[PDB]
Each structure stands twice: as structure tokens, then as C-alpha cells.
């Protein structure tokens, strides 16, 4: 059951839409993941061409972009699921600023 739920989670995040005929001759479908639909705000943080330099200003712009449309979100609330390394790096970057 744990393996089942982990697979479902990974499919919902990184899945892609498809429809194909299976080996028995019947259709086989794959769901479209979360990252499939999110296209407006996708950012690659790093150095080099095609990437955005990581600074406090870039982070503020990235986080404030999602509030442009209220949409259906009530109370202006969002939920963030982040990795431990990324959160620690954000905590480190907030220190250098004269105002955090």
C-alpha cells in the first residue's frame, strides 16, 4: 500500500497525458501530471544560459507572481511543498539582506 501511494503521488506530479493501444488490443491511458498543466510559472534557478540567477529579489518575484489572479482561491492562501535543501538555502539567503 505504501508503494501504491508513492507511485500515485509521483504519477500526479510527473505524469503526462497519453492514449495508446495495449498488447491485448485494448486502450491504455496515462494521466496528465501536475507539471503538465502548470506552464505559465516555471523557473529554473541556477547559473548559465536559460536559467535565472538565485537572489532574494528573484525569489520575491517568483512568489509574488502567483498572486496576480485571485481566481477561486479564497482568503489569498497558498500551500507550498518544498524540499529540505531548498528551504535551508532560502533561510541562508534571507540572512544577507539588511531587511530579511
Amino acid at each position: 500500500m505504501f508503494d501504491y501511494y508513492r507511485d500515485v503521488e509521483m504519477a500526479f506530479i510527473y505524469g503526462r497525458k497519453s492514449e495508446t493501444v495495449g498488447e491485448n488490443g485494448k486502450p491504455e491511458r496515462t494521466t496528465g501530471g501536475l507539471l503538465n498543466f502548470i506552464t505559465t510559472n516555471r523557473t529554473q534557478f541556477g547559473t548559465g544560459a536559460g536559467k535565472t540567477e538565485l537572489t532574494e529579489d528573484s525569489l520575491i518575484d517568483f512568489f509574488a507572481n502567483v498572486f496576480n489572479y485571485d481566481g477561486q482561491g479564497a482568503g489569498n492562501q497558498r500551500i507550498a511543498f518544498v524540499g529540505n535543501t531548498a528551504l535551508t538555502k532560502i533561510n541562508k539567503l534571507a540572512r544577507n539582506s539588511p531587511s530579511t
Partner: protein, 111 residues
């Protein structure tokens, strides 16, 4: 602190070098690093072109900063990076070369 990567023709004609760093005090140091490559982007090599940079405090009056020759550009540089003290909001870059090289341009600023 990277402005553009790739084709010399793809170097932007105007670059915004005004940066909000540190406190409300504006920056007073400006230094430019130029790195050339071979035909392949990863491996470094020399170049034939010459780059010229100009800076404007108000965006219309330009002041000469310096010039860099891609011939000296390589794994170990031999030229001296341009250095300017003062307030600059915009950077003007002009190239005089054959083009079709992968190049590195870097801008360093100080409080």
C-alpha cells in the same frame, strides 16, 4: 552577473546595469569580464573580434569605459578588465568581428 551567452550578433545592443544591492546607497564600482570559446561552446579558445563598452548615467549621454580584444581571451587571460567608478544605469556594447563565436560576458558591481 551574466548578461548574454552565445552569438555575438545576439549580444543585446543595450544592457541594464542598474542594480539594487546592499543598502539604498548606489553602487560605485563597475568591472567587465569577457571570455571567449572555440567553435564548441564548452571548450575555451581565442577570438578575432573586439568589444567596446560605453556607460550612461542618464541613458542618453555615453562615457567610454574600455575595450577588450577576443584575441587575448582564452583559458588564461592577458588583457586588463575595464574598470569605472561612478553611477551607471545603462551599458552600451558594440562588437567588431566576424561573429559566430560563443562568448562570455560578466558584469561585476560593488557598493
Amino acid at each position: 552577473m551574466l548578461v548574454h551567452y552565445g552569438k555575438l550578433s545576439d549580444m543585446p545592443t543595450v544592457v541594464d546595469v542598474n542594480t539594487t544591492m546592499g543598502t539604498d546607497v548606489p553602487e560605485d564600482l563597475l568591472e567587465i569580464y569577457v571570455g571567449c570559446y572555440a567553435a564548441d561552446g564548452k571548450t575555451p579558445a581565442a577570438g578575432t573580434g573586439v568589444l567596446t563598452f560605453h556607460g550612461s548615467w542618464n541613458g542618453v549621454h555615453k562615457r567610454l569605459i574600455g575595450t577588450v580584444d577576443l584575441a587575448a581571451a582564452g583559458e588564461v587571460i592577458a588583457y586588463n578588465p575595464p574598470l569605472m567608478f561612478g553611477g551607471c544605469k545603462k551599458l552600451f556594447v558594440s562588437y567588431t568581428g566576424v561573429g559566430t563565436q560563443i562568448v562570455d560576458v560578466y558584469v561585476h558591481r560593488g557598493e
